[PDB]
Amino acid sequence: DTNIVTLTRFVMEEGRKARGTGEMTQLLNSLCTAVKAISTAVRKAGIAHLYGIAGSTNVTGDQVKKLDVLSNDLVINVLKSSFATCVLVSEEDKNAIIVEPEKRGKYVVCFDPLDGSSNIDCLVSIGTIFGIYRKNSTDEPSEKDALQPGRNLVAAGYALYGSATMLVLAMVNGVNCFMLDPAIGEFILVDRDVKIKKKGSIYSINEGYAKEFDPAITEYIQRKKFPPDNSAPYGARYVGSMVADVHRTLVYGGIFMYPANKKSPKGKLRLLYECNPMAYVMEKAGGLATTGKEAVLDIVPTDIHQRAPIILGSPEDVTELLEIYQKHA
Numbered sequence: 001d002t003n004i005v006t007l008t009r010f011v012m013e014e015g016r017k018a019r020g021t022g023e024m025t026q027l028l029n030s031l032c033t034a035v036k037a038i039s040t041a042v043r044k045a046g047i048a049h050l051y052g053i054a055g056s057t058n059v060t061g062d063q064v065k066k067l068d069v070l071s072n073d074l075v076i077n078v079l080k081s082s083f084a085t086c087v088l089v090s091e092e093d094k095n096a097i098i099v100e101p102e103k104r105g106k107y108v109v110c111f112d113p114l115d116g117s118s119n120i121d122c123l124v125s126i127g128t129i130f131g132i133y134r135k136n137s138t139d140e141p142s143e144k145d146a147l148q149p150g151r152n153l154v155a156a157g158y159a160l161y162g163s164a165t166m167l168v169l170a171m172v173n174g175v176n177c178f179m180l181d182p183a184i185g186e187f188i189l190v191d192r193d194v195k196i197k198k199k200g201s202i203y204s205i206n207e208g209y210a211k212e213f214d215p216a217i218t219e220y221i222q223r224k225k226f227p228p229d230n231s232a233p234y235g236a237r238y239v240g241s242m243v244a245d246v247h248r249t250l251v252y253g254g255i256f257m258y259p260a261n262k263k264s265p266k267g268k269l270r271l272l273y274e275c276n277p278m279a280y281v282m283e284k285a286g287g288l289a290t291t292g293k294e295a296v297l298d299i300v301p302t303d304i305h306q307r308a309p310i311i312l313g314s315p316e317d318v319t320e321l322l323e324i325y326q327k328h329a
């Protein structure tokens with residue numbers, strides 16, 4: 001056990017020939033602290049009475065749970081104290097948060113402090129999603145610094161509070177998985193340079209919305225169930241937590257879908273702190289992420305709480321669905 005490859009060491013070793021201020025390492029070390037604190041609260045949530053609602057509604061009009069508030073506070077406090085950030089965007093705050101000059105650093109951070117809130121009370125996998133941008137402009141920090149295309153990401157990933165706690169981190173040359181050792185409260189490198197399979201055998205979507213689906217989604221699903229070449233039909237999985245469904249897509253292959261539909265032109269999931277981070281992870285693992293008509297990472301945001309359709313996973317799977325949308329174009 002005497003040589004520990006922790007997230008910190010990883011993020012220091014690589015960025016050492018890249019030089020840098022090392023505030024990315026500060027950022028991520030800080031974030032890891034909040035994630036550990038969220039994991040331990042989650043693992044004991046019913047005894048600590050942390051289930052239930054906060055008694056509020058957010059800008060996307062979700063019903064705010066207790067762990068939403070707790071996790072939001074932890075992420076914000078640790079990011080500010082990191083001295084690595086200047087602008088913060090959270091699912092739980094109407095406006096971007098501008099860091100006090102005294103603790104400012106050069107990064108902009110967009111995050112979902114707790115993802116999968118419908119699955120909180122039934123003990124299903126939940127998580128934390130983040131994307132990291134460098135502030136470009138020279139003028140005073142503002143919400144506008146968060147309105148960057150996802151292709152501008154310097155780092156992104158998620159924490160998954162599942163059967164084990166995992167930190168999935170994507171940076172410019174690739175994706176790496178770090179598992180939480182609860183005995184020493186360190187994230188340890190467990191999966192190096194993760195690449196997604198070119199094609200999977202699992203499709204993931206809420207078919208409860210079948211009546212609202214566009215003809216292309218409708219066709220694709222039918223094809224997964226009734227393949228034209230007599231291949232085996234695809235298996236279906238939908239946990240209901242974006243972080244768990246995307247994580248399985250990453251390690252098992254296949255496709256994850258939250259499409260636009262007749263009642264939601266822009267889908268449900270949020271571009272800044274849900275769709276862009278996962279699209280980035282997917283592209284760095286060699287997969288794709290599309291709205292059905294354009295790459296998510298290429299969208300230029302105008303609203304920090306903007307929604308986008310997302311279709312992601314194995315390149316050959318996502319490409320088959322894109323061909324169907326094309327065909328229907």
Ligand SMILES: O=P(O)(O)OC[C@H]1O[C@](O)(CO)[C@@H](O)[C@@H]1O
Nearest residue numbers: 115116117118206240241242243
């Ligand atoms: O109940 P639905 O509409 O399938 O929504 C599930 C999606 O909503 C979210 O909870 C939004 O956070 C995602 O984590 C999840 O993928």
Ligand SMILES: [Mg+2]
Nearest residue numbers: 062063091117
């Ligand atoms: Mg929510």
Ligand SMILES: [Mg+2]
Nearest residue numbers: 112114115116
């Ligand atoms: Mg979410």
Ligand SMILES: [Mg+2]
Nearest residue numbers: 091112114115
């Ligand atoms: Mg959330």
